Design a protein that fits this description.
Protein name (chain A): Elongation factor Tu, mitochondrial
Family (chain A): Belongs to the TRAFAC class translation factor GTPase superfamily. Classic translation factor GTPase family. EF-Tu/EF-1A subfamily.
Number of strands of chain B: 8
CATH superfamily of the largest domain in chain A: P-loop containing nucleotide triphosphate hydrolases
GO molecular function, one term (chain A): GTP binding
Structural class of chain A: alpha+beta
Oligomer: heterodimer
Largest sheet of chain B: 5 strands, antiparallel
CATH class of the largest domain in chain B: Alpha Beta
Strand order of the largest sheet of chain B: 3-4-2-1-6
EC number (chain A): 3.6.5.3
Radius of gyration of chain B: 23 Å
Structural class of chain B: alpha+beta
Order of helices and strands of chain B: HHHEEHHEHHEEEEHHE
Number of helices of chain A: 7
Helix content of chain B: 25-40%
Number of strands of chain A: 22
CATH architecture of the largest domain in chain A: 3-Layer(aba) Sandwich
Enzyme class (chain A): hydrolase
Number of domains of chain A: 3
Largest sheet of chain A: 8 strands, antiparallel
Number of helices of chain B: 9
Strand content of chain B: 15-25%
Distance between the termini of chain B: 54 Å
Distance between the termini of chain A: 47 Å
Number of domains of chain B: 3
Chain lengths: 369, 276
């Protein structure tokens, strides 16, 4: 299983030192692995960076490791550190209280932990059950005093393994397969290739292709992966699905094979969008309302109109904000689905769907090209 | 003991200073809360300067642009810090306010004309030597030190700009990427700030939207000069403000957009946090 964790806190409080101590202990944006799972460790300098990573899906965090120094205790910005975690969807936090290891005062440390739990509770987390480990990242990194160094780091890792859950596969959701390509197998039939977005597919399940003028329905007779004939496929797997009684002409890229009547096309969406800077290959100038770029999602593309939030009349490169987008026509756009926006031959933005509001009269009255 | 632990926590909740500083304050004042608190405040300034010297030199590309308009004076200030987590913190924002008010007070004491508008700037050094508000003590340089000691990040009073306007002139303004913070009355904080100085006999009460829109145009199109109504449209790459394709309608230039409203653009200021 793969887990994404990010380290938040004041730079002078030990983050980088701890991250290094963990690296050296397990050697016996970084990556390490405990007995339980594969870890993707992230440590972004700012709020806008974590939000960008969430929207883009580059490093969607499953949990955070809040590093606080015993001497200073929480800083005023510790509040913004937790607001950020709360905002990007992190619901599990593990705390590491880093100390001057000079065997100082257990009482002071106790008050630090107490204050931290008050804060955690304040921001919706369960401050009473949050694992709080006390130690010295510096001792652990310098192979000195194992009781405060090594011990604390091992305890932190155990706490991360236990309290930060793995990212869900959504295998409980109806299977959804974006069709990437179509081809035939002599004597067997037509095959559609693609990568399952969610749910599970079993040799024999009934399917239905969406995105086509006509609604096509049939059955999956065979599953193929690595030229091996399986009977079950899982979310995330790239496969070939053998369809029953259908010719290549009846299918194409862009269609979506899903569990019969499980998906409802959407034309109006609200989403968190990040606008690319010119340095990232985006636009030089800002774009305003009624800007019509092309949305690319799954294996399809469609024109859409951007509706800036009330009040805002422009959006600048490098900014992220919530926007309303109206597709020229309904498409398979689910909540949690990511997309990109292209103007001409270049991407100008990235998005993550937050809501699928009902199309309003006003939205219907839109005047297109 | 439980009693000493309680005193330490009580002093922490009350003042916000670090636990170690609170502990040293209490033992120094015999465990007397009132004396400990007074002691901590007295040390604050010294601690700040020292901390400011230590962190001095670190990269500070993040921060905020502050816009404060009082009467016929308008000030734009830029204060930098290391992380956007801090630029989002109230303590930092309160410092920006003190910097704006300090600038405002300084300006409302400078050159005040009747026939035309007055404009002026202040570099880092100049802004730093400015007298802190009648509230605090010392210069903004001292207040900056206090903030640096409270937030633990290097910070810089980057620059300021002010404008004073007599009747016959109007200032349109806009801050982009505004931050919510209702405790700082009249102040508007964000990543981009623009002032557009105009000459007009139209009542100010009917120019609020136009004013905001001109500001939006400056932020979004970043003109390098005012230009002229005599020049021809310049396309999406134009530098002269008046010839640039109007932000909210490229069909027309900014000059063609504003002229009809009985307003002429004579000057402007554009601040982008962390630029250059």
């Amino acid at each position: 299983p793969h887990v994404n964790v990010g380290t938040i806190g004041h730079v002078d409080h030990g983050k980088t030192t701890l991250t290094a101590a963990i690296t050296k202990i397990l050697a016996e944006h970084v990556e390490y692995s405990t007995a339980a799972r594969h870890y993707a460790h992230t440590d972004c300098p700012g709020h806008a960076d974590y939000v960008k990573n969430m929207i883009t899906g580059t490093a969607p965090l499953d949990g955070c490791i809040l590093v606080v120094a015993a001497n200073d205790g929480p800083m005023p910005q510790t509040r913004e550190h937790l607001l950020l975690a709360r905002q990007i969807g992190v619901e599990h936090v593990v705390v590491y209280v880093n100390k001057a290891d000079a065997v100082q005062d257990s009482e002071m440390v106790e008050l630090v932990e107490l204050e931290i739990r008050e804060l955690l509770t304040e921001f919706g987390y369960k401050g009473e059950e949050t694992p709080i480990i006390v130690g010295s990242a510096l001792c652990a990194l310098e192979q000195r005093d194992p009781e405060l160094g090594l011990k604390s780091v091992q305890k932190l890792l155990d706490a991360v393994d236990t309290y930060i859950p793995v990212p869900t596969r959504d295998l409980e959701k109806p299977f959804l397969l974006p069709v990437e390509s179509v081809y035939s197998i002599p004597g067997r039939g037509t095959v559609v290739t693609g990568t399952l977005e969610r749910g599970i597919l079993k040799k024999g399940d009934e399917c239905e292709f969406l995105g086509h003028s006509k609604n096509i329905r049939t059955v999956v007779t065979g599953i193929e992966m690595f030229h091996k004939s399986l009977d079950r496929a899982e979310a995330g797997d790239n496969l070939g699905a053998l369809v029953r009684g259908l010719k290549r002409e009846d299918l194409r890229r862009g269609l979506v094979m899903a569990k019969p009547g499980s998906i409802q096309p959407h034309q109006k969406v609200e989403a968190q969008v990040y606008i690319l800077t010119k340095e990232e290959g985006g636009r030089h100038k800002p774009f305003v309302s009624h800007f019509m770029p092309v949305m690319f999602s799954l294996t399809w593309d469609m024109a859409c109109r951007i509706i800036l939030p009330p009040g805002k009349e422009l959006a600048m490169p490098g900014e992220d904000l919530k926007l309303t987008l109206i597709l020229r026509q309904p498409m398979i756009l689910e909540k949690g689905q990511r997309f990109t926006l292209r103007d001409g031959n270049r991407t100008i933005g990235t998005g993550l769907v937050t809501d699928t509001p009902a199309m309003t009269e006003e939205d219907k009255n839109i005047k297109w090209s | 003991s439980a009693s000493s632990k309680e005193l330490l926590m009580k002093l922490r909740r009350k003042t916000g200073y670090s636990f170690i500083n609170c502990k040293k304050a209490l033992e120094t004042c015999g465990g007397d809360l009132k004396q400990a608190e007074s002691w901590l405040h007295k040390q604050a300034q010294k601690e700040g300067w020292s901390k400011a010297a230590r962190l001095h030199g670190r990269k500070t590309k993040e921060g905020l642009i502050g816009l404060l308009q009082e009467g016929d004076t308008t000030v734009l200030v830029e204060v930098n810090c290391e992380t956007d987590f801090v630029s989002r913190n109230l303590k930092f924002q309160q410092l920006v306010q003190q910097v704006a008010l300090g600038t405002l007070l300084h300006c409302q004491n400078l050159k005040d004309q009747l026939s035309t508008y007055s404009k002026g700037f202040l570099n880092s050094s100049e802004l730093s030597e400015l007298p802190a508000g009648p509230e605090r003590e010392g210069s903004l340089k001292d207040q900056l030190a206090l903030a640096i000691g409270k937030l633990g990040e290097n910070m810089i009073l980057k620059r300021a700009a002010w404008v004073k306007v007599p009747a016959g002139f109007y200032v349109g303004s806009y801050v982009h990427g505004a931050m919510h913070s209702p405790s700082l009355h009249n102040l508007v904080l964000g990543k981009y700030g623009a002032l557009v100085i105009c000459e007009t006999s139209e009542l100010k009460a009917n120019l609020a939207d136009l004013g905001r829109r001109l500001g939006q145009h400056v932020v979004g199109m970043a003109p390098l000069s005012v230009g002229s109504l005599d020049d021809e449209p310049g396309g999406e790459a134009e530098t002269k403000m008046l010839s640039q394709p109007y932000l909210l309608d490229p069909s027309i230039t900014l000059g063609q957009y504003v002229q009809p409203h009985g307003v002429s653009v004579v000057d402007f200021v554009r601040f982008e946090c962390g630029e250059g």
